[PDB]
Amino acid sequence: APGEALYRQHCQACHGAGRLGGSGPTLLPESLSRLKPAQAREVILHGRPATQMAGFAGQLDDAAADALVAYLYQAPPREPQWSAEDIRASQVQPHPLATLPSRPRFEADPLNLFVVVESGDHHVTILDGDRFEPIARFPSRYALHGGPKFSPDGRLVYFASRDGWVTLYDLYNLKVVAEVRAGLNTRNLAVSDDGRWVLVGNYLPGNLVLLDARDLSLVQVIPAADAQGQASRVSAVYTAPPRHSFVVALKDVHELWELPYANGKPVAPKRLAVADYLDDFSFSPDYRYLLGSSRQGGEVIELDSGARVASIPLSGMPHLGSGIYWKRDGRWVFATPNISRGVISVIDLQNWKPLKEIVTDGPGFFMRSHADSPYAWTDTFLGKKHDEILLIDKQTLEIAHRLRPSPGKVAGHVEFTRDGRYALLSVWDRDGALVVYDAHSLEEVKRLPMNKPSGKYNVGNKIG
Ligand code: HEC
């Protein structure tokens, strides 16, 4: 085909042999699932503003650009592999933990640090959570995915990237400890509650990759396949601390997995049959129940027996993974945003009966709160109107307040300081910002300019 030859001559230098990546990102069909071919075409011709991807309009014509786009989105004749041997060969260890002191090199409170993902230019900022000033900034792997995870004591932070790279960062020494490429297209990762294991959930290959959390060395590649042998992508991996287990959502088979690690490296799944494909898990506070979205509403499964105990039909497809729990009149309640409709659904835990449907302007994506806050903070991140953060009173279940940090720009995602006194909102824009708010007065206290900040993650709240 003409695309391949054009690719070798003009592209392989940076995007690598087989489109696996190199200087530039991986360019497999899975890698480009969020990039429409017309957008890829414009990137190839004119480049990406303010990056190392320059335009090629002067080197190739319309037919050559179309040929290249067609090649990038075409499935290869055989699926690319990423073996145990590939994984081990990719490990690097610039600052092994054995060689580093175990003392914070800074004066900021280690438990109030924010890890801030700067997705516009693929950097990470480490923020002093009391001064709201950076103590470190470093370039990350391209297109971080899934939000960072922490070691149990909050000293170490683990990043996963779209194209399969895992990064271990030591917050005390402000240094990259190790990196490894666990797959070719990665969904997210999870850290065991005893701090020993990293479990990586991959789309490509369809597998789980188990790493030693101290140096990102390979422990075992676990192919994702149901009991009948049918291959599957991993949708997401989660930690269930009271069960000392990983819980795995599988994209393409009627199974979900629990991998216990109390007795050692979690290499053997306990398989639980599900009636329908189930991903985007949420866990009840006691981790006895799993709330998932089925390909057909919400499904409540008991983890031990795997029995389906209740079904909750809700408008549109609710984003159960982002839902949160709190006590309202001395009884657990659960609230979830929605991907296609503009509503916040509130469910009663005791009976799994819906309590109230709070109507909003548009579909949202994020939800957060704090023991010290009387509101649940959410958004309409996915709607046509999307510059407002909504504060839903935990008791009245109504939008009590609204926050509009940058009128006209996408506002979304909220994280608090460890004591809940301040809330940090992201304006997801090239001319974006991290906006600090007093969580009780609700007034803007500070604003940090950033290129498309996405999530920020408070050590204290993430490990508490
Ligand atoms: C190195 C100097 C490169 C060469 C030669 C080519 N590309 Fe590239 N490309 C490169 C980088 C560093 C990046 C990432 C830029 C960023 O956002 O930080 C890219 C990006 C792309 C993309 C977008 C991928 C995405 O995930 O959004 C595409 C579609 C792409 N590049 C295609 C492409 C083609 C077809 C090339 C030869 C014709 C080519 N690139 C050359 C680095 C480099």
Side-chain angles (χ1 to χ4, degrees), residues 1-294 297-311 313-349 352 354-355 357-383 385-397 399-429 431-464:
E4 161 180 355
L6 290 171
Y7 179 88
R8 274 195 289 269
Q9 172 61 21
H10 300 269
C11 318
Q12 167 156 343
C14 299
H15 298 286
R19 303 185 267 153
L20 294 190
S23 149
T26 308
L27 296 183
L28 294 169
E30 293 85 346
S31 318
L32 305 177
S33 67
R34 263 85 141 189
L35 184 71
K36 289 192 190 63
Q39 301 169 332
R41 195 174 185 276
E42 295 287 6
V43 175
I44 293 168
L45 290 174
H46 307 120
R48 191 160 272 167
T51 78
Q52 184 179 95
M53 177 59 190
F56 289 83
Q59 291 88 302
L60 50 87
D61 51 41
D62 279 354
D66 303 332
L68 273 165
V69 174
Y71 176 72
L72 293 192
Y73 288 83
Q74 171 63 51
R78 280 281 72 91
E79 182 183 278
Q81 311 288 293
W82 202 244
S83 71
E85 288 68 43
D86 293 313
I87 297 170
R88 290 192 207 97
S90 75
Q91 191 201 12
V92 291
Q93 292 186 74
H95 302 99
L97 281 176
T99 68
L100 295 170
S102 284
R103 160 186 201 101
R105 280 180 152 283
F106 46 80
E107 305 210 90
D109 174 6
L111 296 178
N112 207 16
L113 295 176
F114 289 90
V115 177
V116 182
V117 178
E118 295 176 81
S119 76
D121 45 13
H122 309 289
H123 279 73
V124 169
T125 283
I126 308 300
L127 202 78
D128 183 330
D130 294 299
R131 294 197 249 208
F132 303 110
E133 304 169 12
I135 64 172
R137 188 180 188 256
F138 55 98
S140 69
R141 296 282 173 169
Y142 178 81
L144 296 184
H145 266 196
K149 300 293 195 299
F150 295 88
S151 60
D153 62 2
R155 170 180 170 185
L156 306 172
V157 54
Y158 302 78
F159 302 94
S161 84
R162 179 189 86 187
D163 301 334
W165 287 94
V166 180
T167 304
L168 172 54
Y169 188 84
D170 178 5
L171 289 165
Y172 288 6
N173 287 282
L174 303 173
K175 283 173 180 304
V176 176
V177 169
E179 303 189 277
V180 75
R181 190 178 194 183
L184 299 177
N185 189 256
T186 292
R187 290 282 280 192
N188 78 322
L189 59 72
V191 182
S192 60
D193 80 280
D194 60 7
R196 294 177 70 191
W197 315 113
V198 177
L199 188 68
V200 185
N202 287 329
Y203 255 26
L204 179 71
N207 65 19
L208 300 159
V209 172
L210 179 63
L211 307 170
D212 187 316
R214 298 287 279 273
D215 56 11
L216 299 185
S217 62
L218 177 59
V219 182
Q220 204 170 315
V221 176
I222 306 169
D226 70 9
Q228 297 188 300
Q230 195 168 327
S232 178
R233 298 169 290 178
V234 174
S235 182
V237 298
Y238 313 88
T239 302
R243 308 177 66 87
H244 306 302
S245 74
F246 291 117
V247 175
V248 180
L250 295 174
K251 196 67 183 154
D252 305 301
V253 291
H254 298 258
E255 274 178 21
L256 70 90
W257 288 3
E258 186 175 15
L259 291 87
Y261 51 76
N263 286 106
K265 50 179 180 180
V267 293
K270 182 186 173 186
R271 296 168 191 267
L272 290 69
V274 294
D276 199 59
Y277 302 108
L278 201 156
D279 67 328
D280 207 20
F281 301 169
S282 168
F283 295 92
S284 53
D286 70 347
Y287 289 86
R288 270 190 64 247
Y289 299 99
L290 172 159
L291 295 78
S293 52
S294 61
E299 299 287 330
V300 182
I301 288 176
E302 187 168 6
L303 259 185
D304 298 339
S305 51
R308 176 172 46 175
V309 301
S311 286
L314 312 169
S315 163
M317 40 191 181
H319 184 20
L320 292 174
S322 294
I324 63 166
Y325 304 75
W326 72 83
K327 307 203 81 73
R328 179 195 192 272
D329 291 335
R331 56 194 302 93
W332 283 116
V333 69
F334 173 80
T336 180
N338 195 288
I339 295 189
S340 65
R341 260 51 196 173
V343 61
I344 303 296
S345 298
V346 184
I347 303 306
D348 179 85
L349 273 216
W352 311 106
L355 261 166
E357 263 203 343
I358 307 173
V359 56
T360 71
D361 286 13
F365 197 83
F366 297 106
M367 207 150 183
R368 204 72 153 88
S369 188
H370 195 273
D372 178 90
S373 183
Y375 319 102
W377 305 47
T378 192
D379 60 66
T380 70
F381 190 82
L382 307 171
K385 156 80 155 168
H386 53 73
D387 50 19
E388 220 157 277
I389 299 301
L390 310 174
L391 276 58
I392 299 175
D393 187 88
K394 286 179 182 173
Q395 198 63 63
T396 74
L397 310 197
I399 304 176
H401 297 87
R402 306 169 118 103
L403 292 181
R404 195 174 178 189
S406 285
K409 307 198 179 188
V410 48
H413 189 276
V414 175
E415 187 81 345
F416 299 89
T417 51
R418 62 182 301 210
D419 67 355
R421 278 187 303 149
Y422 299 97
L424 284 68
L425 281 56
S426 289
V427 179
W428 297 57
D429 189 277
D431 194 291
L434 192 60
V435 193
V436 185
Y437 286 82
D438 188 316
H440 297 282
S441 85
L442 307 197
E443 310 270 358
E444 171 175 340
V445 170
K446 186 163 183 171
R447 188 176 292 249
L448 292 76
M450 288 186 189
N451 187 350
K452 304 251 280 157
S454 48
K456 78 295 306 190
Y457 305 84
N458 183 266
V459 171
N461 288 329
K462 301 309 301 199
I463 74 177

